[PDB]
Amino acid sequence: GVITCKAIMLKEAKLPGMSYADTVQIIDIQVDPPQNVELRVKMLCASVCRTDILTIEGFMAPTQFPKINGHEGVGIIESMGPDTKNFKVGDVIVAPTLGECQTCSSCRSGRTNFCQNYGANESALEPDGTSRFSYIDSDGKKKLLYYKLGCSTWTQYMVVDSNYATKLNEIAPELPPPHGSILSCAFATGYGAVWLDAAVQEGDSVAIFGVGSVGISAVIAAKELKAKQIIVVDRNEYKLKMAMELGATHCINSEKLPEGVTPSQAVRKLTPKEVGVDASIESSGYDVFMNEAMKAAIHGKAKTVITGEGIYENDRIFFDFKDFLFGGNVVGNVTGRVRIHSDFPGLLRKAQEPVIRAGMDKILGYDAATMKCKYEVDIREGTPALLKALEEVENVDCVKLVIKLNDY
Amino acid sequence: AKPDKNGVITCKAIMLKEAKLPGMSYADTVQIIDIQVDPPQNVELRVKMLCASVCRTDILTIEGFMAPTQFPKINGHEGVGIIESMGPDTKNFKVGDVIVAPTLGECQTCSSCRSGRTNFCQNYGANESALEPDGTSRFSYIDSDGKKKLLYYKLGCSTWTQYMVVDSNYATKLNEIAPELPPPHGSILSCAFATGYGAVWLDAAVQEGDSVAIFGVGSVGISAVIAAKELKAKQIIVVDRNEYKLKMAMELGATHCINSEKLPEGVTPSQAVRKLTPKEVGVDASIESSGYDVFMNEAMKAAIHGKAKTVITGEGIYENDRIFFDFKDFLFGGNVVGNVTGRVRIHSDFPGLLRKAQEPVIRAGMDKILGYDAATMKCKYEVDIREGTPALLKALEEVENVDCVKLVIKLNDY
Ligand SMILES: NC(=O)c1ccc[n+]([C@@H]2O[C@H](COP(=O)([O-])OP(=O)(O)OC[C@H]3O[C@@H](n4cnc5c(N)ncnc54)[C@H](O)[C@@H]3O)[C@@H](O)[C@H]2O)c1
Ligand SMILES: NC(=O)c1ccc[n+]([C@@H]2O[C@H](COP(=O)([O-])OP(=O)(O)OC[C@H]3O[C@@H](n4cnc5c(N)ncnc54)[C@H](O)[C@@H]3O)[C@@H](O)[C@H]2O)c1
Ligand SMILES: [Mg+2]
Ligand SMILES: [Mg+2]
Ligand SMILES: [Zn+2]
Ligand SMILES: [Zn+2]
Ligand SMILES: [Zn+2]
Ligand SMILES: [Zn+2]
Incomplete structure (x- = not known):
């Protein structure tokens, strides 16, 4: 049940004076099957949030390296843990930082998304201290990889607790991947x-x-x-x-x-x-x-x-x-x-109105005929292309770099 | 006090000469002096003060807080008094009304007032100049050289004075809702x-x-x-x-x-x-x-x-x-x-707060803050502006006593 796939690994923090080449590499990883209420998700694309670059620089990760980067992305459910409810294999999901239990005093206030029960997974681990990601190093040792928070998106496959997921496919079946990816953050x-x-x-x-x-x-x-x-x-x-x-x-x-x-x-x-x-x-x-x-x-x-x-x-x-x-x-x-259950469905519907879609197209530089974005790099095209793309996040006209992970 | 034939009142006030910077004494900057208080203009109230009470922000003001250029001044923003006279344009106040006049008025028509959720009125905001809008002050004194000098306010007024002048757009009355409320309780309701x-x-x-x-x-x-x-x-x-x-x-x-x-x-x-x-x-x-x-x-x-x-x-x-x-x-x-x-908006919220202040448990708590004795109308820590600068300097040092919760400065007979 273990998938081998490509992922973007961060070896250690990129401190001032260090390069992307010093810490970022595309490697083959092992992704364990989902347990409990987890979704294992075939990713379509990630897109680069400034917080993803801060993560490369060590933000919120004083010990949590090596890791797979990324929190902004979209993908399709490949499999589910045995306890999962309210999702199907084939659903298109995003999984932001905060879930919505709907019963804690924060959810019940109606005025915040800071849920007391499904808050940010700062450990970058499963609650038992383990990780669904690992890799085989050049020594031939199996080594743990940390998540970003509850999951990592810079990977062909991720695992996430379904209390953090919300689906796109019922409301927005035709939504292109990059639009789903920026809707996630x-x-x-x-x-x-x-x-x-x-x-x-x-x-x-x-x-x-x-x-x-x-x-x-x-x-x-x-x-x-x-x-x-x-x-x-x-x-x-x-x-x-x-x-x-x-x-x-x-x-x-x-x-x-x-x-x-x-x-x-x-x-x-x-x-x-x-x-x-x-x-x-x-x-x-x-x-x-x-x-x-x-x-x-x-x-x-x-x-x-x-x-x-x-x-x-x-x-x-x-x-x-x-x-x-x-x-x-x-x-x-x-x-x-934007609460994942109470607000996100409405935002997804709004996103499909023509002026809102036009604005998302402009952010992305999206070409609907080719499904390509102005600044795009594919995880299958090797580490050098990725390092160049990460430098080009600072180009004056790079609003949102997309990382393609799989065929659409 | 009685005005002279030109309407000017001479009375006692607590003057701050300059900021009390670190290492300086209260004696370096704080003095009770005789001041002149001009008659009110426009929509101003001239108010016979009953008492001021000492807010930590009063002590910060002595240390120069928010007053880079606005010395010398009369201190004080917390206090209560009785209208003695009014400018000719004043609406909705009478001579004899008991008022407090905090930092923010309530025009009721600006978008901040109409939001219902703030007191930061766009038309009657904090008077940070510590002057009248024309750059004058209703306060002056004669210095040791015989020259008439200007005194700045705290913000729109000063309370550490037997008589103050304030724009009536910042005032709210106590005597209709709470005619028996003692002065020090009114003073703490002002801040x-x-x-x-x-x-x-x-x-x-x-x-x-x-x-x-x-x-x-x-x-x-x-x-x-x-x-x-x-x-x-x-x-x-x-x-x-x-x-x-x-x-x-x-x-x-x-x-x-x-x-x-x-x-x-x-x-x-x-x-x-x-x-x-x-x-x-x-x-x-x-x-x-x-x-x-x-x-x-x-x-x-x-x-x-x-x-x-x-x-x-x-x-x-x-x-x-x-x-x-x-x-x-x-x-x-x-x-x-x-x-x-x-x-607490002075028109929309203050009346309700003043009604709450008269409820027995709330009054008991106000009495405890003040250490108020109803028999003498005296507070546990109290100094009188009429009793000299040395007693005031000691009282200011005693603001730091562990059991001084609220020092009251009595200004006039009650
Ligand atoms: N709170 C969240 O959930 C959340 C989600 C998304 C991103 N973020 C953070 O929000 C911010 C915006 O995200 P983004 O992906 O759009 O980032 P970005 O780097 O793509 O864009 C930031 C913009 O701010 C401008 N800016 C930055 N420093 C500036 C300065 N010194 N002078 C003037 N302009 C300056 C930049 O020129 C740029 O156009 C980032 O700091 C990101 O880490 C937080
Ligand atoms: N925003 C306003 O409208 C407004 C109104 C009133 C007072 N103030 C300010 O609010 C604050 C409270 O006013 P107050 O007159 O009750 O002041 P105060 O000095 O009488 O009381 C402040 C309390 O905070 C405690 N405190 C201060 N520093 C401390 C520290 N290092 N460790 C532990 N406790 C500490 C003191 O021991 C004291 O009991 C002051 O800073 C004052 O300037 C502002
Ligand atoms: Mg889990
Ligand atoms: Mg005036
Ligand atoms: Zn983000
Ligand atoms: Zn909750
Ligand atoms: Zn105060
Ligand atoms: Zn207003």
């Missing part, structure tokens, strides 16, 4: 941050700090929800122009501001009476933008939704104290607050 | 009590059966305990290093107490709080009322991820004017808000 996060957490209403103003794939998904949501004003802030003019094309109304290049004008000052100057924005979204990973987004919000009334991640000194972020006391309102957000 | 009570009642929206953590049980945190008890919280966990105020908190409804200076080896305040909750899930509502930057982060971490709100009331003079949060715990369900005056 990037698109849910940006869209949800605006729709659910900031709770943007028709006529609200929105500021979005960082228009990578997450920020652009937030623009798409703000436009869909008929925000009066959608302000985008970034150093990347290509991605600012893409945000404007998908509905942003005002753009600010933060690296072209005068030295004495902060990003929050620049945002506030666009709003009437310098009052700030109804909803402030941070989607950059830049600790400075977390404090700027907090400042750009209308004091008291508006919520600042922090989605960014990064490797911060002492794992700490900072806020300017006076501006925080006098009306700051900041929340941490994982996966857009 | 300390509203802040702790409102942080629990309005901002954290504590429900019957919720668990609550309160970091710092000074007057603000003890007011939070009183609210959490009134709202029938299941669990009220208080954290501090002052054993006297932890014990007062327990007497007024706290269920568990933690001494942050006596924790086991390897245990943070947030861990200590979570250890008292089922499966170490933390609390439904986390209140910070200490001014200790460490406790703002511990309060964030004690809250149930995602579900709970952490309400930050604390103030201080911090390294690089910033505070910090542990990033992984913050991203994975942190929820932190800045709170001024408990989110």
Whole structure:
């Protein structure tokens, strides 16, 4: 029942000064059959979240190497543990970081996805300390591989606890793989941050700090929800122009501001009476933008939704104290607050509307005739092609790199 | 006091000459002096103050908090008084009304007011200039050289004065709902009590059966305990290093107490709080009322991820004017808000709070915070502006006494 397949292994953290070649390799791994309520999933593609690059740099993994990378991806159920309910072999699933038990006081509040019973699997292991992944090293020893959290997506086959899975095939049978892959993290996060957490209403103003794939998904949501004003802030003019094309109304290049004008000052100057924005979204990973987004919000009334991640000194972020006391309102957000049972089905339906699909196509640079994305690499084409693709994640026009894992 | 023929009142006020920086004394910067108080203009109230009461933010103001250029000033934002006169444009107030005038007004028409969920009014926000909008001040003094000099406010007014002037858009009346309320209770309703009570009642929206953590049980945190008890919280966990105020908190409804200076080896305040909750899930509502930057982060971490709100009331003079949060715990369900005056809106919420303050258990708790003696109308720690600068300097040092919860500054006969 053991599958042998290709996976992207991280040997150790890539610390500053080290290369991708030093730590990243495509290898053959062994994937054990699923136990209990687990799904073993034939992956179609992964797509590269900035958090995947932070993971390569050791984020949230002080001991959890070697590992198979990745949390953003989509695939098809190949087999299931004997206790599984509510899934079938052949279902198309995504498996984000947080499940939804629907019975804990967090689920029952109706206002959060931080489920007390199906929270983030920070151990990067099965609950017994084992892993469904292993490999045979050059010494010929069988060695354990850690997951990312509850699973790894940079692999032709993964195993995940079905309490974290949600299916695509009943609502969206024709959804292309790359779209399913960004729905598993990037698109849910940006869209949800605006729709659910900031709770943007028709006529609200929105500021979005960082228009990578997450920020652009937030623009798409703000436009869909008929925000009066959608302000985008970034150093990347290509991605600012893409945000404007998908509905942003005002753009600010933060690296072209005068030295004495902060990003929050620049945002506030666009709003009437310098009052700030109804909803402030941070989607950059830049600790400075977390404090700027907090400042750009209308004091008291508006919520600042922090989605960014990064490797911060002492794992700490900072806020300017006076501006925080006098009306700051900041929340941490994982996966857009999009609960896998209560919210994700509705987001999946929305994603199929033509303007939403067009925006996802633009994020991906998707060609529906060829099913190819602008920036794509196939796990079957070897380690050198992958290392080059990982470097090209920093290209100005690379919004979302796709890793193809199997035939579609 | 009686105005001169030009309407100017001469009275006592507590002047701050400059910031009391580290190593400086209260004697270096704090003096009771005679000041002139101009007549009110426009929609202003000129108010005969009954008493001020000492908020930790008053002491921060003495240390220069939020006042890089706004010295010399008259201190104080917590206090109560009686309208003596009004500007010609004033609406909805009478001479003789008893008022308090906190930092935020409530226009009722801006998008923040109409949200129903904040007190941060866009039209009547904090007056950080510590001046009138034209750059004048209603306060001046004659210095030792014989020259008339300007005095800054705290924000929109100063309370440490026998007579204050404030824009009536920041005032709310006590005498219709609570005519018998004593002055020091009115004073703590203007800041300390509203802040702790409102942080629990309005901002954290504590429900019957919720668990609550309160970091710092000074007057603000003890007011939070009183609210959490009134709202029938299941669990009220208080954290501090002052054993006297932890014990007062327990007497007024706290269920568990933690001494942050006596924790086991390897245990943070947030861990200590979570250890008292089922499966170490933390609390439904986390209140910070200490001014200790460490406790703002511990309060964030004690809250149930995602579900709970952490309400930050604390103030201080911090390294690089910033505070910090542990990033992984913050991203994975942190929820932190800045709170001024408990989110208690002066028109929409204050009347209800003033009615609650008259209920017997709530009044008993206010009496305990103040150490109030109804027979003498005197508080346990009280100093009178009419009795000289030396007595004031001693009282300011005695703010640090373990059993000083709320120092009252009497300003006028009651
Ligand atoms: N909370 C979650 O569930 C969640 C989900 C998705 C991604 N993330 C995090 O959210 C962030 C956004 O994800 P992404 O994949 O879109 O990342 P990304 O790297 O693709 O895009 C980030 C954008 O922010 C901009 N930015 C970063 N630093 C900047 C600076 N110094 N000046 C100006 N602009 C700056 C970049 O130019 C870029 O356009 C990342 O930090 C990622 O790790 C978190
Ligand atoms: N946001 C507002 O509207 C508002 C209103 C009132 C007060 N404040 C601020 O809120 C805080 C509470 O005000 P207060 O007048 O009750 O203050 P206070 O100083 O009388 O009481 C603070 C309490 O916190 C405890 N604390 C402080 N540092 C500590 C440490 N290192 N370890 C353990 N415990 C510690 C103290 O021992 C004390 O019991 C202050 O910072 C004050 O400046 C703000
Ligand atoms: Mg398992
Ligand atoms: Mg005025
Ligand atoms: Zn991600
Ligand atoms: Zn749950
Ligand atoms: Zn105060
Ligand atoms: Zn208003």
